[PDB]
Ligand binder design. Structure first.
Ligand SMILES: CC[C@H](C)[C@@H]1NC(=O)[C@H](C[C@@](C)(O)CO)NC1=O
Ligand SMILES: O=C(O)CCC(=O)C(=O)O
Ligand SMILES: [Fe+2]
Length: 280
């Protein structure tokens, strides 16, 4: 079975769904489709996702295979081979200008500002006072969050699930996928996410679920996975998290209606605990 998702577009007033009920369903499901702006070139990102794992013999992006987590002082970044079919290149915004090719950093900036606009629509729909958005979002209601532009390749020769079931860590994931494999578990049945290369997939992460757990319409971090791939597959995603630097962590908060924000845990703590549960 395949999920019937709502489609939205960024317009003059923010996220535009077909109607208010459609937006309600999309937000309650925790996953929806977002039209890719026509001016936005994704071809360099798509090529990077197809090449990053192939090593320095493959121009212009294969060389990023050689950049392991040590080159960054942050074990989460660089090239990672996972226990599932997936292998990844992960890089946080603070390194894009220095480390990514210039056109890949440009892509990451476009996606940051786009995700910024998406997140502020969601925050307004949740009824959180505007002056709490910055702390509630760890800077992502502006542009001071932590942002990962992450590229994925599924090694079909590996006899694993493509990517185990998990929820994302942060507030918003903007996912660029062009092939089948992504599945979501809204309402206790797994469903394929329909493929539409003219749309991003948008879903919420654990920090959105924590943030809104006490609101009148709590939003959920959708459980999703990538089924076992018989041929190779690639994708990439822009992930927005509470500012989670090694030295400067913005914290994870739950909004208490009529009271304010209360601290739950750290942003890096959440990413580490989540990343443990997925792969072990
Ligand atoms: C360090 C992860 C970063 C915060 C971000 N947050 C996610 O939740 C996913 C995690 C995943 C499943 O892609 C790792 O394999 N990706 C990302 O880039
Ligand atoms: O490759 C995909 O479609 C999903 C990737 C993903 O869910 C992730 O990296 O967290
Ligand atoms: Fe994910």
């Amino acid at each position: 079975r395949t999920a019937d998702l709502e489609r939205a577009r960024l317009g003059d007033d923010g996220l535009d769904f077909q109607d208010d009920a459609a937006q309600a369903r999309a937000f309650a499901q925790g996953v929806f489709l977002l039209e890719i702006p026509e001016w936005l070139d994704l071809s360099a990102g798509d090529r990077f996702a197809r090449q990053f794992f192939q090593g320095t013999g493959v121009e212009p992006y294969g060389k990023y295979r050689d950049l392991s987590s040590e080159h960054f002082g942050d074990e989460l970044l660089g090239y990672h081979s996972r226990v599932d079919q997936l292998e990844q290149f992960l890089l946080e915004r603070r390194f894009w200008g220095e480390v990514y090719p210039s056109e890949i950093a440009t892509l990451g900036e476009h996606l940051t500002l786009l995700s910024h606009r998406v997140l502020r629509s969601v925050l307004a729909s949740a009824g959180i006072p505007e002056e709490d958005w910055h702390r509630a979002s760890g800077g992502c209601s502006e542009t001071n969050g932590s942002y990962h532009l992450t590229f994925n390749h599924y090694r079909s020769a590996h006899q694993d699930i493509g990517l185990s079931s998990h929820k994302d860590d942060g507030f918003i994931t903007v996912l660029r996928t062009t092939a089948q494999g992504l599945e979501v578990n809204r309402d206790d049945v797994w469903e394929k996410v329909p493929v539409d290369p003219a749309c991003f997939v948008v879903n919420f992460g654990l920090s959105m679920e924590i943030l809104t757990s006490a609101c009148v319409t709590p939003l959920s971090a959708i459980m999703h996975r990538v089924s076992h791939q018989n041929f190779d597959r690639s994708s990439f995603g822009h992930f927005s998290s509470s500012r989670c630097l090694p030295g400067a962590d913005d914290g994870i908060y739950r909004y208490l209606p009529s009271a304010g924000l209360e601290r739950v845990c750290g942003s890096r703590e959440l990413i580490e605990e989540n990343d443990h549960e997925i792969y072990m």
